[PDB]
CSV table of all heavy atoms in Angstrom, one decimal:
chain,number,residue,atom,x,y,z
A,1,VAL,N,0.9,-1.2,0.0
A,1,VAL,CA,0.0,0.0,0.0
A,1,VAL,C,0.9,1.3,0.0
A,1,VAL,O,0.4,2.4,-0.3
A,1,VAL,CB,-1.0,-0.1,1.2
A,1,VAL,CG1,-1.6,1.3,1.5
A,1,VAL,CG2,-2.0,-1.1,1.0
A,2,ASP,N,2.2,1.1,0.3
A,2,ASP,CA,3.2,2.2,0.3
A,2,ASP,C,3.2,2.9,-1.1
A,2,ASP,O,3.5,2.2,-2.0
A,2,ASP,CB,4.6,1.7,0.7
A,2,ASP,CG,5.6,2.8,1.1
A,2,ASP,OD1,5.3,4.0,0.8
A,2,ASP,OD2,6.6,2.5,1.7
A,3,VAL,N,2.7,4.2,-1.1
A,3,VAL,CA,2.8,5.0,-2.3
A,3,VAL,C,4.2,4.9,-3.0
A,3,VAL,O,4.3,5.0,-4.2
A,3,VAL,CB,2.5,6.5,-2.0
A,3,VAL,CG1,3.1,7.5,-2.9
A,3,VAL,CG2,0.9,6.7,-1.9
A,4,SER,N,5.2,4.8,-2.1
A,4,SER,CA,6.6,4.7,-2.6
A,4,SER,C,6.9,3.4,-3.3
A,4,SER,O,7.9,3.4,-4.0
A,4,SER,CB,7.6,4.9,-1.4
A,4,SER,OG,7.8,3.6,-0.8
A,5,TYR,N,6.1,2.4,-3.1
A,5,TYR,CA,6.1,1.1,-3.9
A,5,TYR,C,5.1,1.3,-5.1
A,5,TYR,O,5.5,1.0,-6.3
A,5,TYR,CB,5.7,-0.1,-3.1
A,5,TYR,CG,6.9,-0.7,-2.3
A,5,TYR,CD1,6.8,-1.0,-1.0
A,5,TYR,CD2,8.0,-1.1,-3.0
A,5,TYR,CE1,7.9,-1.6,-0.3
A,5,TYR,CE2,9.1,-1.7,-2.3
A,5,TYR,CZ,9.0,-1.9,-0.9
A,5,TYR,OH,10.0,-2.5,-0.3
A,6,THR,N,3.8,1.7,-4.9
A,6,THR,CA,2.7,1.5,-5.9
A,6,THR,C,2.9,2.5,-7.1
A,6,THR,O,2.8,2.0,-8.2
A,6,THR,CB,1.3,1.7,-5.2
A,6,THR,OG1,1.3,3.1,-4.7
A,6,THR,CG2,1.1,0.7,-4.1
A,7,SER,N,3.3,3.7,-6.8
A,7,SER,CA,3.7,4.7,-7.8
A,7,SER,C,4.8,4.1,-8.8
A,7,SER,O,5.1,4.8,-9.8
A,7,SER,CB,4.3,6.0,-7.2
A,7,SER,OG,5.4,5.7,-6.3
A,8,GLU,N,5.4,3.0,-8.5
A,8,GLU,CA,6.4,2.3,-9.3
A,8,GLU,C,5.9,1.1,-10.1
A,8,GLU,O,6.6,0.7,-11.1
A,8,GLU,CB,7.7,2.0,-8.5
A,8,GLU,CG,8.3,3.2,-7.7
A,8,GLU,CD,8.6,4.5,-8.4
A,8,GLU,OE1,8.5,4.6,-9.7
A,8,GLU,OE2,9.0,5.5,-7.7
A,9,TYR,N,4.7,0.6,-9.7
A,9,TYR,CA,4.0,-0.4,-10.5
A,9,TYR,C,3.7,0.1,-11.9
A,9,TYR,O,3.5,1.3,-12.1
A,9,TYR,CB,2.7,-0.9,-9.9
A,9,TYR,CG,2.9,-1.6,-8.5
A,9,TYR,CD1,1.8,-1.5,-7.6
A,9,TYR,CD2,4.0,-2.3,-8.2
A,9,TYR,CE1,1.9,-2.1,-6.4
A,9,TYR,CE2,4.1,-2.9,-6.9
A,9,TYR,CZ,3.1,-2.8,-6.0
A,9,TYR,OH,3.2,-3.4,-4.8
A,10,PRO,N,3.6,-0.8,-12.9
A,10,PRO,CA,3.2,-0.4,-14.3
A,10,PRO,C,1.7,0.0,-14.3
A,10,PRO,O,1.0,-0.6,-13.6
A,10,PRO,CB,3.5,-1.6,-15.2
A,10,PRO,CG,4.4,-2.5,-14.3
A,10,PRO,CD,4.1,-2.2,-12.9
A,11,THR,N,1.4,0.9,-15.2
A,11,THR,CA,0.0,1.3,-15.6
A,11,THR,C,-0.3,1.0,-17.0
A,11,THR,O,0.4,1.5,-17.9
A,11,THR,CB,-0.3,2.8,-15.2
A,11,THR,OG1,0.0,3.0,-13.8
A,11,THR,CG2,-1.8,3.1,-15.5
A,12,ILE,N,-1.2,0.1,-17.2
A,12,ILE,CA,-1.5,-0.6,-18.5
A,12,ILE,C,-3.0,-0.3,-18.9
A,12,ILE,O,-3.8,-0.3,-18.0
A,12,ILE,CB,-1.4,-2.1,-18.4
A,12,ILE,CG1,0.0,-2.6,-17.9
A,12,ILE,CG2,-1.7,-2.8,-19.8
A,12,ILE,CD1,1.1,-2.2,-18.9
A,13,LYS,N,-3.2,0.0,-20.2
A,13,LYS,CA,-4.5,0.4,-20.7
A,13,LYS,C,-4.9,-0.7,-21.7
A,13,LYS,O,-4.2,-1.0,-22.7
A,13,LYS,CB,-4.4,1.7,-21.5
A,13,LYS,CG,-4.7,3.0,-20.6
A,13,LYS,CD,-4.5,4.3,-21.4
A,13,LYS,CE,-5.7,5.2,-21.2
A,13,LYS,NZ,-5.4,6.6,-21.4
A,14,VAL,N,-6.1,-1.4,-21.4
A,14,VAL,CA,-6.7,-2.4,-22.4
A,14,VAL,C,-8.1,-1.8,-22.9
A,14,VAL,O,-8.9,-1.6,-22.0
A,14,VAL,CB,-6.9,-3.7,-21.8
A,14,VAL,CG1,-7.6,-4.7,-22.8
A,14,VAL,CG2,-5.6,-4.3,-21.3
A,15,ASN,N,-8.2,-1.6,-24.2
A,15,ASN,CA,-9.4,-1.1,-24.9
A,15,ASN,C,-10.1,-2.2,-25.6
A,15,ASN,O,-9.7,-2.6,-26.7
A,15,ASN,CB,-9.0,0.0,-25.9
A,15,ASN,CG,-10.2,0.9,-26.4
A,15,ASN,OD1,-11.3,0.5,-26.3
A,15,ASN,ND2,-9.9,2.1,-26.9
A,16,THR,N,-11.1,-2.8,-25.0
A,16,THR,CA,-11.8,-4.0,-25.5
A,16,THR,C,-12.6,-3.6,-26.8
A,16,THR,O,-12.4,-4.2,-27.8
A,16,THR,CB,-12.7,-4.7,-24.4
A,16,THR,OG1,-13.6,-3.7,-23.8
A,16,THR,CG2,-11.9,-5.3,-23.4
A,17,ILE,N,-13.4,-2.5,-26.7
A,17,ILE,CA,-14.1,-1.8,-27.8
A,17,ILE,C,-13.3,-2.0,-29.1
A,17,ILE,O,-13.8,-2.6,-30.1
A,17,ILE,CB,-14.4,-0.4,-27.5
A,17,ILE,CG1,-15.1,-0.1,-26.1
A,17,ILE,CG2,-15.2,0.3,-28.6
A,17,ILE,CD1,-16.2,-1.1,-25.8
A,18,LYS,N,-12.1,-1.4,-29.1
A,18,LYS,CA,-11.3,-1.1,-30.3
A,18,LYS,C,-10.2,-2.0,-30.5
A,18,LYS,O,-9.4,-1.9,-31.5
A,18,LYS,CB,-10.8,0.4,-30.2
A,18,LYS,CG,-11.8,1.5,-30.4
A,18,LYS,CD,-11.1,2.8,-30.8
A,18,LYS,CE,-10.7,2.9,-32.3
A,18,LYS,NZ,-10.7,4.3,-32.8
A,19,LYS,N,-10.0,-3.0,-29.5
A,19,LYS,CA,-8.8,-3.9,-29.5
A,19,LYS,C,-7.5,-3.1,-29.6
A,19,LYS,O,-6.7,-3.3,-30.5
A,19,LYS,CB,-9.0,-4.9,-30.7
A,19,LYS,CG,-9.5,-6.3,-30.3
A,19,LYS,CD,-11.0,-6.4,-30.0
A,19,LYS,CE,-11.4,-7.8,-29.8
A,19,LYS,NZ,-12.4,-8.0,-28.7
A,20,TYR,N,-7.4,-2.1,-28.7
A,20,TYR,CA,-6.1,-1.4,-28.4
A,20,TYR,C,-5.6,-1.7,-27.0
A,20,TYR,O,-6.4,-1.8,-26.1
A,20,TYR,CB,-6.4,0.1,-28.5
A,20,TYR,CG,-6.5,0.7,-29.9
A,20,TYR,CD1,-7.3,1.9,-30.1
A,20,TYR,CD2,-5.8,0.3,-31.0
A,20,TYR,CE1,-7.4,2.5,-31.3
A,20,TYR,CE2,-5.9,0.9,-32.2
A,20,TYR,CZ,-6.7,2.0,-32.4
A,20,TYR,OH,-6.8,2.5,-33.6
A,21,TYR,N,-4.3,-1.8,-26.9
A,21,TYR,CA,-3.6,-1.8,-25.5
A,21,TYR,C,-2.4,-0.8,-25.6
A,21,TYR,O,-2.0,-0.4,-26.7
A,21,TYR,CB,-3.2,-3.2,-25.1
A,21,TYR,CG,-2.1,-3.8,-26.0
A,21,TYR,CD1,-0.9,-3.3,-26.1
A,21,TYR,CD2,-2.4,-5.0,-26.6
A,21,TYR,CE1,0.1,-3.9,-26.9
A,21,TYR,CE2,-1.5,-5.6,-27.4
A,21,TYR,CZ,-0.2,-5.1,-27.6
A,21,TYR,OH,0.7,-5.7,-28.4
A,22,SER,N,-2.0,-0.4,-24.4
A,22,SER,CA,-0.7,0.5,-24.3
A,22,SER,C,-0.2,0.4,-22.8
A,22,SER,O,-1.0,0.1,-21.9
A,22,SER,CB,-1.0,1.9,-24.7
A,22,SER,OG,-1.8,2.6,-23.7
A,23,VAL,N,1.1,0.6,-22.7
A,23,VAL,CA,1.8,1.0,-21.4
A,23,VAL,C,1.6,2.5,-21.3
A,23,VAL,O,2.5,3.2,-21.8
A,23,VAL,CB,3.3,0.6,-21.4
A,23,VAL,CG1,4.0,0.9,-20.1
A,23,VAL,CG2,3.4,-0.9,-21.8
A,24,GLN,N,0.6,3.0,-20.5
A,24,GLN,CA,0.5,4.4,-20.1
A,24,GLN,C,1.8,4.8,-19.3
A,24,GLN,O,2.4,5.8,-19.7
A,24,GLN,CB,-0.7,4.6,-19.3
A,24,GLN,CG,-1.0,6.1,-19.1
A,24,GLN,CD,-2.1,6.3,-18.1
A,24,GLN,OE1,-2.8,5.4,-17.7
A,24,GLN,NE2,-2.4,7.6,-17.7
A,25,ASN,N,2.2,4.0,-18.3
A,25,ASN,CA,3.4,4.3,-17.5
A,25,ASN,C,4.1,3.0,-17.1
A,25,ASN,O,3.5,2.3,-16.3
A,25,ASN,CB,3.1,5.1,-16.3
A,25,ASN,CG,4.4,5.5,-15.6
A,25,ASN,OD1,4.9,4.8,-14.7
A,25,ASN,ND2,4.9,6.7,-16.0
A,26,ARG,N,5.3,2.8,-17.7
A,26,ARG,CA,6.2,1.6,-17.4
A,26,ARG,C,6.6,1.5,-15.9
A,26,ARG,O,7.2,0.5,-15.6
A,26,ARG,CB,7.4,1.6,-18.3
A,26,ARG,CG,8.4,2.7,-18.1
A,26,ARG,CD,9.7,2.5,-18.8
A,26,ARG,NE,10.7,3.5,-18.4
A,26,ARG,CZ,11.6,3.4,-17.4
A,26,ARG,NH1,11.7,2.3,-16.7
A,26,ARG,NH2,12.4,4.4,-17.2
A,27,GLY,N,6.4,2.6,-15.1
A,27,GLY,CA,6.9,2.6,-13.7
A,27,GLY,C,8.4,2.3,-13.7
A,27,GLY,O,9.1,2.8,-14.6
A,28,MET,N,8.8,1.6,-12.7
A,28,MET,CA,10.3,1.2,-12.5
A,28,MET,C,10.5,-0.2,-13.1
A,28,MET,O,11.1,-1.1,-12.4
A,28,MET,CB,10.8,1.3,-11.1
A,28,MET,CG,10.7,2.8,-10.5
A,28,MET,SD,11.8,4.0,-11.4
A,28,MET,CE,11.3,5.5,-10.5
């Protein structure tokens, strides 16, 4: 739950509608 850990996890976008994905933020 430490912000100092979670802010470093990756943020991934999956678009089912349009069959798009992306790495919004690769984190560490």
Side-chain angles (χ1 to χ4, degrees):
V1 164
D2 196 343
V3 154
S4 83
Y5 277 127
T6 62
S7 58
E8 305 305 356
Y9 297 153
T11 306
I12 306 294
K13 272 180 127 152
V14 178
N15 195 341
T16 52
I17 308 315
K18 287 200 78 151
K19 257 78 174 139
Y20 283 150
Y21 63 65
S22 71
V23 180
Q24 191 187 352
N25 189 268
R26 69 165 185 95
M28 299 295 178

